[PDB]
Amino acid sequence: VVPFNGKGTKASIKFQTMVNWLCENRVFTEDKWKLVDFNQYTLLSSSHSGSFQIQSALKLAIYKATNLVPTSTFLLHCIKDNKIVKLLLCQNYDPLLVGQHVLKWIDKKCGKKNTLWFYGPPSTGKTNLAMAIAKSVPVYGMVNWNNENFPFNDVAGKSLVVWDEGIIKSTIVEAAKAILGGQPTRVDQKMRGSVAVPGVPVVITSNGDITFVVSGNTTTTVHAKALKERMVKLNFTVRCSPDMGLLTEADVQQWLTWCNAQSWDHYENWAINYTFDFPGINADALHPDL
Amino acid sequence: VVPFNGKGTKASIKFQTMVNWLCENRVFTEDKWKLVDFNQYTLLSSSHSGSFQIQSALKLAIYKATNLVPTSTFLLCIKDNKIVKLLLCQNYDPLLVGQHVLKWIDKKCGKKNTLWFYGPPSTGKTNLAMAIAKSVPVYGMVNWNNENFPFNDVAGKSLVVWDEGIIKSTIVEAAKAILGGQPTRVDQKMRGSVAVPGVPVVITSNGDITFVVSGNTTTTVHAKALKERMVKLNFTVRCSPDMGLLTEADVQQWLTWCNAQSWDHYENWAINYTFDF
Amino acid sequence: VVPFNGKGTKASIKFQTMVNWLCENRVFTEDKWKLVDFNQYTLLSSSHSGSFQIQSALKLAIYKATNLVPTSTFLLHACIKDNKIVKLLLCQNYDPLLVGQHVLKWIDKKCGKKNTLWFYGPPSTGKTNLAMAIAKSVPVYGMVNWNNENFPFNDVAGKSLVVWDEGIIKSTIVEAAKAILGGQPTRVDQKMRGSVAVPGVPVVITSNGDITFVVSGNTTTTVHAKALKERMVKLNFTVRCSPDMGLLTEADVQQWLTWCNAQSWDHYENWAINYTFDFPGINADALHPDLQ
Amino acid sequence: VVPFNGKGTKASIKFQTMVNWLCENRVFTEDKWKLVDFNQYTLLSSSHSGSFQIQSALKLAIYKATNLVPTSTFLLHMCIKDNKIVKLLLCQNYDPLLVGQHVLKWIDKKCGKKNTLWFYGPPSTGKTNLAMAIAKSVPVYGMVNWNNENFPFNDVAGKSLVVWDEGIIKSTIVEAAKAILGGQPTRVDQKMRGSVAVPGVPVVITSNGDITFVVSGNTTTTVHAKALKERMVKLNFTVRCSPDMGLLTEADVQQWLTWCNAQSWDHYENWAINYTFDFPGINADALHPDLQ
Amino acid sequence: VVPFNGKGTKASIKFQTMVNWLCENRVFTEDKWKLVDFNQYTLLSSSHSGSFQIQSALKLAIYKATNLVPTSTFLLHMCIKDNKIVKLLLCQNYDPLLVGQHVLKWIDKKCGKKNTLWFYGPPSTGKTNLAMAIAKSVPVYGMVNWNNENFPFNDVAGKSLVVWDEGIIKSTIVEAAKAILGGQPTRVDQKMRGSVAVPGVPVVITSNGDITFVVSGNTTTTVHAKALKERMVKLNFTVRCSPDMGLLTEADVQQWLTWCNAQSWDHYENWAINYTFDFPGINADALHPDLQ
Amino acid sequence: VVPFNGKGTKASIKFQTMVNWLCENRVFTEDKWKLVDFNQYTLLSSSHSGSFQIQSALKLAIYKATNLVPTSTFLLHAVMCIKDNKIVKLLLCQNYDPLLVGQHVLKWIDKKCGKKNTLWFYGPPSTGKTNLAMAIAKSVPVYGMVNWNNENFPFNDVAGKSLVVWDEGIIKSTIVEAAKAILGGQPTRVDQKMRGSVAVPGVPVVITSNGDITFVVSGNTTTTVHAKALKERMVKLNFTVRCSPDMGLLTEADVQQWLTWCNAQSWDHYENWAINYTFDFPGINADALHPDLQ
DNA sequence: AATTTT
Ligand SMILES: Nc1ncnc2c1ncn2[C@@H]1O[C@H](COP(=O)(O)OP(=O)(O)NP(=O)(O)O)[C@@H](O)[C@H]1O
Ligand SMILES: Nc1ncnc2c1ncn2[C@@H]1O[C@H](COP(=O)(O)OP(=O)(O)NP(=O)(O)O)[C@@H](O)[C@H]1O
Ligand SMILES: Nc1ncnc2c1ncn2[C@@H]1O[C@H](COP(=O)(O)OP(=O)(O)NP(=O)(O)O)[C@@H](O)[C@H]1O
Ligand SMILES: Nc1ncnc2c1ncn2[C@@H]1O[C@H](COP(=O)(O)OP(=O)(O)NP(=O)(O)O)[C@@H](O)[C@H]1O
Ligand SMILES: Nc1ncnc2c1ncn2[C@@H]1O[C@H](COP(=O)(O)OP(=O)(O)NP(=O)(O)O)[C@@H](O)[C@H]1O
Ligand SMILES: [Mg+2]
Ligand SMILES: [Mg+2]
Ligand SMILES: [Mg+2]
Ligand SMILES: [Mg+2]
């Protein structure tokens, strides 16, 4: 497996150095490139040859950053007063257990049931947490439940997929099973042929139940047992005040950094059987610093 | 982050100087470029490379203008103004709307970035929206009657105006992100990605679009969710066809006069964001 | 402000010279370019860059000639009872004098919200003939694509009149027509140049059937009828024409508008406060004595 | 209108020389170039620019040799009772002389609004064969593509004839069909461009069933029918043809039209004073002695 | 006609030499080129110009080899009783001599209007195997794509034969199908291009049900019955084939056709006077003495 | 068959060497290229010409590798106990003889099994049907998946692929013709996107469905017209015994153990079935299974 | 872009 000779001219070396500079500075989107450095962007976008290099460098940097180290490294790079822990205790759940669950889920280590399902009443802290999580990974994709024919664009290459108000029909019910479970497969692209998506973490929030397939309008639960084998649920019960705002990067970063000095002793025992619904908190709250 | 050493050819510096000239002279469209400097347009439009450079320079100048200062700086007799007389005839107080729009176009008045027009047909509703959109650097137009492909061509524009549409069910949730002003990703029906970061929106429509229609029966539980941050404006009895189209200089003078007025009335109005003024 | 200090290669100066030559000789179409100077057209068409230069130069010349310079002047560069257009107008029992004044005031955008002009009637009534005769007199005119579904209003930007012929208001593009027909500026996609910000142009529509009934996929609705009616001017053609009238040339339009230009601008001013849907019928004591 | 003083490179001179050679050797299609000069085709097809030059040169040669020359001159150049077309026309109970005169006058756009010929009848009767034989003598002919409802009327610009073989008018493209069949200048969109300004082209249509009825989804409408019959002339082909007839040749139609041109024109004018939808049948009284 | 004197550079000469080499070695497809000379193919595929040259050279070589030459010469080049095709035809109750003679006549567009050969029967009877056996002997063969509904007749220009495997005619492509199976020169539509001139090619169709019944929506119509019947010759296959017969190679086709051609033809033109929709059966009293 | 005497340049020679490198190092895909030789990928991806050369070299390497040698050589290639193989245990649990299945899939991957060109796995959910199919599909040099909702283009992905996979296969009425043509396994031509048609010389197909597929759906109803014809070109397996959430995504390296063993033993039990195939795979024989696994 | 796409 010795590398090819290659060598390369000055342009190749300059492009490789630019890719390294982008990767080491945590720049992964065009807007971040514009904010961080404007002179380089303006110089590069002055010609067709320069404009072609922008997309190539961006995707190469994204791939190198994603493949070289796991997402946990990115998510890690007052403890009992953060917004996340307050919300989670309000919704009657142990923050530590779900934190361990998400840390395992991002790295594709939750077995077949590698998904986060959010079922609950509307306007009760559902999409806010999902968006806060999704903004911390280098890049995230959004699944299109509609159009019945291109429902999985911009999924390949991304490090996490997000679903809102999910509606699942039989035409996606079993096709999306591998994506929900993180199995490698091939997904088509517009004006292209297949993309070979290798499996990504998936989080879905829905007001209505999704395990029943909408058979046009009758909504027949033919794939009853099929869908529930892929996702684990985390129900939402109570409401919250309308002045919470954006949960930002710092709070979620600290919340995920919390689970770096404790032990997961309950998780491995809970890992023996994957419950369809996450077990609520009963009498195991009040961590020494809570 | 430390800048990267990217010493380029002379063409790069020429493009940089061209972009600087475009941004300094407030030229943000092809028509203004042709009106001001026809020689440069003719010189550049002689080859594909020149056309590409023109397009890239326009986009970069627009972005530099937008992401440098808030848009109000691009805007900053009293009764003789046409807009004053229109709102007086539209039985609405011009002062409250003037103080509201300035905060609404700054992306800082909380999450209250929503304007919308409906009511009597042929009553000066496209005129005001067009005059407002002619004052921002650039505006983006898209309809809402498709209710399946309605957010195409909205990224990169300071303000988005919808001169048509009807609210359907399939896109109830997605608008709740764009109307709210939160970053999201939407389809474009010919391309793939959008990465829209959220921008102020103005929509004008004629028919009943107020209800969040679910097929035929409106499910009003979702209406309040939009309603916390969907302050509405309504028009009234039709206008004479002599006024025509309102220009942009009068808008400048009107907003400049309204800038120095009291800000306490709107702050007191801010406690209760009623859906009708 | 101060013009930018750009320096261009000799090829760019040659391009500018060609643009100036095109503007001075009033050449705004490819066919006219072939008729006048075929040698240079053949010279340019050797390579792809030549074709690109041809298109760019044509568009630039059209814009340079069209800026300022109200369109009516282009129609006034050059007895009257024997005029074919006048005879056709009398055949339909309409005033040949008021129609000319309305055309003059409408092609310069000095009309108001009534930016359109509808030609309605049974087949073989000269609607298309008159529409094309009016169209060919302006520098350049566009047309609405009948079925493209992605660029329905292409060939509109950079023009002077739009002769939407056989017309039907598709429910897919009903709201774009609601904006184009009104004359207010709007932006549309233009085959690579996404968004165009059209300034607005006068419109003429011909049809054998009513176009205010928008087809709703399969059925026909009436919700949009009032809005379209508010900004349209109708004109009813009823009498069948002779089988061998022939095509109306540019000279007939030139003569008719030249005659209508230098007369009393007062009857239109009387019929300027109220813009009724349809033109009034012919009146005995309202025609010029030269027509009597 | 003094032509531009610009002068091109040597490659442009070679392009002009090739265009002149193509125009003066009566080569208008790729097949003629392939079977006349294979070497030049092979040398040009070695790169993209060569193919572009090929296409542009062919189009320019078409324009040079077609402009300001009536089409019938190309059709015009022994016994007459043994001509295949004459026998076929006599079998269908039509006057060959009148049909020949009508075809000669129709191809020159000198028939007013009757710009379309319609061949109607049961299968295996000779409509397609005769239509193709007529269409094979013009400098170049274009065909309307059947099932592409996004660019339904491509391949029409530049061509001197349009053939609609086995055509049915659909409600999606009926406006464009009405515009094209009329025989008036319009603007139709083309690939890699926008609009082409086709100045009217004669059309021939062959069908087994009625086409005035317009299909739409699963229902047939008759609103457009009365607005179409004025643009068409109908010929009824009934008598079945023998299997050994073979394909007609351009020589047969050339001889037939050359003979038909030199005869009397009074009967055709007498019929043409009032054009009718249906072509008059054979009149045994006229019965030119050369065909008795 | 005097050939053009314009010469080319070394690249054009090399391209022409490559075209001649491709023509002389009977390399008419990419697979054969890769199989024979992989080194040159690898050398060429390293740039866009190389791929363009590959496509152009292949097309030009195919045209040069297949022009002004009967197609049957490619079909034509041991006991005949043991040939697999002969045994299959005997098992199907047909005369191999007559079928081979009809195939030879049909392939060189010399079978009148009967320009379509149809195979009909229950599943697993050898229809597709035989159809593809004679499709690998012609230089290049084309396939009609099943589900496109917008470009149903790509890869048909330049091919010497067309195969329709498991084909059913939908109501939206019946006109184009009729035009193609007619076997007359027409013009078709191509992606990224504007119409190619197809001079008519033989078509062979295999199906399990009846294709003369046109499917429209969810129902079946029989309006287009006689027109489709006039252009086809139908063969009936029954009796299930051996489970391990294999794939019929081109050597079997060549041997069978050479033997069929070497004999007489007097028994063929007896039936060729009146072509029938149904192929005549086998009578034990008329077989060639070799097969008795 | 004298080759053309054309002389290449330095760039062409470099491209040929790169193609040889790709063919030798078994890199017949793009992700493997990024994983193994990332720096060269970055050097090549700095221009349009390099981007074109990447695809050209990949296609040429795939063709050169798969042109002559049968795919069974790629599968076999090249030791723990035989009973330790997870696939063997699963097949035994499903009441099937692993030897017969291994021999059949070795013969089927080379198109040596007559008209039978499709493998069908039928069973209730969670019996381990997708895992085995994907494990087999990960051993071939390159595989394709038919499009799920692309009704206009249901077979775009099958173009120069060693195997095609159809998960949750449901056959509609408007796809039956193309589906039958592809499943037949004969040299055909299929339409791509944005371009003309390409040639497919026949590709083995593996399918996985939770319900019957010989019953074809039409609009909203079901018809059995295309029943015998589809059954004429399929071999069916039943996975009735449900499994436990234990098998962690069976890797490709398992099949090398399973197939190499199966090819080792004598074949004088499969040809007794290969003379006359059946629609359904014969069940388990108690007094015939190889004692090395009992 | 046109095709594909609905
Ligand atoms: N093309 C035009 N040129 C000049 N003035 C115009 C034009 N169109 C409209 N106006 C004027 O603008 C005012 C209102 O026009 P308009 O913008 O159409 O209102 P509208 O409510 O959006 N039309 P509608 O959609 O029927 O409700 C009136 O004073 C009109 O005279
Ligand atoms: N190609 C033509 N050449 C010459 N004169 C023509 C031609 N087409 C139409 N005419 C003349 O124009 C008259 C009818 O005008 P026309 O262009 O058909 O307008 P129209 O009434 O709108 N027809 P239609 O669009 O079907 O309703 C005919 O009677 C002819 O005298
Ligand atoms: N491929 C062919 N080769 C030779 N002669 C042909 C061919 N096709 C048709 N013919 C002759 O043309 C006669 C029928 O004319 P045809 O071209 O079918 O016109 P048509 O009546 O329009 N047929 P159709 O279009 O099917 O309704 C046949 O009897 C043949 O003599
Ligand atoms: N892929 C294949 N490999 C080997 N032999 C094959 C193959 N396909 C078919 N055969 C042989 O060909 C025989 C029948 O050929 P076949 O192509 O099925 O005829 P067919 O009836 O036209 N097909 P069908 O359309 O399903 O009826 C089979 O019995 C086999 O002997
Ligand atoms: N992503 C995964 N990670 C770990 N184990 C998995 C995964 N996907 C499937 N499995 C295991 O594979 C076995 C069954 O998977 P599978 O092959 O999908 O059965 P199946 O019946 O084919 N499901 P389906 O294809 O949707 O009908 C179980 O033991 C699962 O635990
Ligand atoms: Mg008309
Ligand atoms: Mg026909
Ligand atoms: Mg078959
Ligand atoms: Mg599965």
Author numbering:
A (entry chain A): 202 to 278, 286 to 498
B (entry chain F): 202 to 277, 286 to 486
C (entry chain E): 202 to 279, 286 to 499
D (entry chain D), E (entry chain C): 202 to 278, 285 to 499
F (entry chain B): 202 to 279, 284 to 499
Any passages from the paper?
The main replication protein NS1 plays a critical role in cell cycle arrest, transactivation of viral and host genes, and replication and package of B19V genome. Based on its similarity to other parvoviral replication proteins, such as Rep72 of the adeno-associated virus (AAV), NS1 is predicted to contain one nuclease domain (Nuc, aa 1–176), one oligomerization domain (OD, aa 201–270), one SF3 helicase domain (SF3 HD, aa 271–501), and one zinc-binding domain (ZnD, aa 571–671). The SF3 HD domain of NS1 belongs to the SF3 helicase superfamily, which unwinds DNA with 3′→5′ polarity. Totally, four cryo-electron microscopy (cryo-EM) structures were determined, which revealed the detailed mechanisms for ATP binding and hydrolysis and DNA binding and unwinding by NS1.
To reveal how NS1 unwinds DNA, a DNA with overhangs at both ends, the overhang DNA-2, was designed and included in the cryo-EM sample. One ternary complex was determined at an overall resolution of 3.3 Å. Since the dsDNA region is disordered and only the ssDNA portion and AMPPNP are observed, the structure was termed as NS1_2-570/ssDNA/AMPPNP complex hereafter. Instead of dodecamer, NS1_2-570 exists as hexamer in the NS1_2-570/ssDNA/AMPPNP complex. The ssDNA mainly interacts with the SF3 HD domain with the 5′-end pointing toward the OD domain. In the NS1_2-570/ssDNA/AMPPNP structure, the ssDNA adopts B-form-like conformation; its backbone phosphate groups form several H-bond interactions with the side chains of Lys398 of NS1 protomers B–E. The side chains of Met399 of protomers B–E point toward the sugar puckers of ssDNA, forming hydrophobic stacking interactions. However, unlike the DNA-free structure, the SF3 HD domains adopt asymmetric assembly and tilt toward the central channel in the ssDNA-bound structure. Direct superposition showed that ssDNA binding also leads to large conformational change at the 393–407 region, which folds into a short α-helix in the DNA-free structure and a β-sheet in the DNA-bound structures, respectively. The side chain of Arg438 forms one H-bond interaction with the γ-phosphate of AMPPNP, and the β-phosphate interacts with the side chains of Lys320 and Gln391.
